Amino acid sequence: VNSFSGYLKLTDNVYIKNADIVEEAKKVKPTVVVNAANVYLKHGGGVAGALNKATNNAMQVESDDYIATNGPLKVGGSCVLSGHNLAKHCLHVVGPNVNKGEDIQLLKSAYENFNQHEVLLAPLLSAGIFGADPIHSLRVCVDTVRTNVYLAVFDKNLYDKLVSSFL
Numbered sequence: 367v368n369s370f371s372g373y374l375k376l377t378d379n380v381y382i383k384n385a386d387i388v389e390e391a392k393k394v395k396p397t398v399v400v401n402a403a404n405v406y407l408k409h410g411g412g413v414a415g416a417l418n419k420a421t422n423n424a425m426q427v428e429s430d431d432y433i434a435t436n437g438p439l440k441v442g443g444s445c446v447l448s449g450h451n452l453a454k455h456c457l458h459v460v461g462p463n464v465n466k467g468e469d470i471q472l473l474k475s476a477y478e479n480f481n482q483h484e485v486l487l488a489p490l491l492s493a494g495i496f497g498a499d500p501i502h503s504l505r506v507c508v509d510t511v512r513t514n515v516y517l518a519v520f521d522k523n524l525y526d527k528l529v530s531s532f533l
């Protein structure tokens with residue numbers, strides 16, 4: 367039993383809700399919140415900009431030190447950093463950005479990072495401003511993630527389309 371509330375159950379392990387991931391994380395304070403990161407951990411917009419703003423830029427400061435030490439992530443890769451005031455940990459995961467010409471096949475690799483954590487609050491990877499089809503992202507999530515994932519879909523219209531189209 368966990369404290370996530372109001373989710374629709376899609377499969378044994380995947381749950382979904384129309385919600386603002388910032389507000390959800392603040393309410394639940396999950397062990398792991400997933401950020402829709404880029405390889406430079408530059409949290410400018412989309413989920414990343416919103417999560418970073420909610421940390422008063424502390425996420426960006428921490429991320430800049432991470433990059434200075436380790437260099438960029440790989441597309442499809444991840445790193446674990448602090449969750450600041452939002453969660454215990456933030457799993458920064460880089461899905462492919464179609465608006466940059468990146469290989470959509472890497473979306474499965476991106477979701478594989480979730481399997482290293484028993485329970486996560488997460489967005490749909492490569493959706494929104496990353497330019498991929500969210501129906502596809504949800505399908506890859508369901509077919510790749512085996513741990514317990516609570517998906518927050520900000521757009522209510524998109525959420526209804528995702529539920530109504532789910533196979």
Ligand SMILES: CN(C)C[C@@H](CO)Nc1ncnc2[nH]ccc12
Pocket residue numbers: 385386387388402412413414416489490491492493494495518519520521524
């Ligand atoms: C907007 N939508 C079409 C894309 C999704 C990523 O697929 N973006 C989010 N999902 C959940 N919470 C969020 N807060 C801020 C942005 C955001």
Ligand SMILES: [Cl-]
Pocket residue numbers: 411412413493494495496
């Ligand atoms: Cl977005």
